[PDB]
Design a protein around this ligand. Structure first.
Ligand SMILES: [Ca+2]
Length: 350
């Protein structure tokens, strides 16, 4: 049930011993899913399996870059199985893999509760793939999931976040910024990225760039430095959050943005990937439709000492970007400051 990211898979029907295939090596929406005898190197018979929310999988064709789908979102017996572009919010594109005792799988629609099937128990080339109600004895509903060779995934080196700078003396000049370090990344399939180098060409995109890397880079930025006299109160203002421009870059690239609660706000072609994104980039799922904006905060500092007190304030900066196989960036990064992750450092220490 834990299939491998970047492993090419073929689906061998128990009854026919023939393979899930896209009719005519077609690239377009609504192209028929059929069975066809084993071919040594036809990409139309190979699929990536990408894990989705709630332990479903996307079945992504290596020729088309489109996914296994139910024609017209039908819930009935005999409804046709086709390919269609990954939408995210289409339950007919989500598949649950039930393992049987002999190692075959039954492949159940999230939408319909019916399973992949060969129409009429047919054994011939080009026999149609449909959905049918789950049946205890129906070898036409059983598929062997066979590894057909794995593809290298992009990678980047991660490390711990820099610590917040501290005063050793009242005279120390604390840095404007710490080193920028990658604290997390996640590998997402091409279905997850709208890349202007490919536009709507899903076939060319999956052939050249089947997997992208979403990178999270973080550092501390100094907002304020001041030395308070004894008895001094120092008041100041900060601007935090994210530019509308940067939210638009996130939305058009990976179809998520930053919620007002600092969580990931998922919609469209990022739906189904909320668990992977939140877990692997170590950021909560947003509990709000409200989007983070630039906001102004008011701050005060009072000096509790009978001597001068040095004061700096640091805020956590997070930059996200999407990296191609070839190391280039899709669109541009988006950058936020988190008002809920700010630290004051003083000398003497408080
Ligand atoms: Ca079909």
């Amino acid at each position: 049930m834990t299939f491998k990211v970047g492993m090419k898979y073929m689906f061998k029907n128990k009854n026919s011993r023939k393979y899930l295939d896209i009719s005519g090596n077609q690239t377009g929406n609504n192209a028929n899913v059929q069975q066809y005898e084993y071919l040594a190197d036809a990409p139309s018979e190979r699929f990536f399996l990408h894990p989705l929310d709630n332990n479903y999988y996307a079945m992504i064709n290596l020729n088309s870059g489109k996914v296994i789908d139910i024609s017209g979102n039908q819930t009935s017996n005999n409804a046709n199985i086709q390919q269609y572009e990954w939408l995210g919010d289409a339950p007919s594109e989500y598949w649950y893999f039930h393992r049987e005792a002999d190692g075959h799988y039954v492949i159940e629609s999230k939408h319909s509760g019916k399973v992949l099937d060969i129409e009429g128990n047919q054994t011939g080339n080009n026999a149609n793939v449909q959905q049918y109600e789950y049946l205890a004895d129906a070898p036409s509903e059983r598929f062997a999931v066979e590894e057909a060779g794995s593809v290298s995934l992009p990678s980047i080196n991660t490390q711990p976040l820099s610590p917040v700078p501290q005063y050793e003396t009242i005279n120390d000049q604390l840095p404007e910024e710490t080193e920028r370090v990658v604290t997390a990344f996640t590998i997402v399939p091409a279905i997850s990225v709208k890349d202007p180098h490919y536009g709507g060409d899903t076939a060319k995109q999956i052939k050249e760039n089947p997997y992208y890397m979403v990178v999270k880079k973080q550092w501390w930025k100094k907002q304020e430095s001041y030395v308070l006299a004894p008895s001094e109160r120092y008041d100041f203002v900060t601007t935090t959050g994210i530019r509308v421009t940067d939210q638009e870059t996130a939305t058009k690239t990976v179809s998520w943005s930053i919620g007002a609660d600092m969580g990931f706000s998922f919609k469209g072609f990022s739906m189904g990937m909320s668990s992977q994104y939140s877990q692997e980039l170590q950021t909560s799922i947003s509990h709000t439709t409200e989007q983070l904006k630039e906001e102004t905060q008011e701050h005060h500092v009072t000096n509790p000492f009978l001597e001068r007190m040095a004061y700096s304030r640091y805020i956590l900066v997070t930059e996200y970007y999407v990296q191609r196989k070839n190391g280039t960036i899709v669109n541009a990064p988006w950058t936020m400051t988190d008002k809920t992750n700010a630290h004051a450092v003083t000398f003497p220490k408080s």
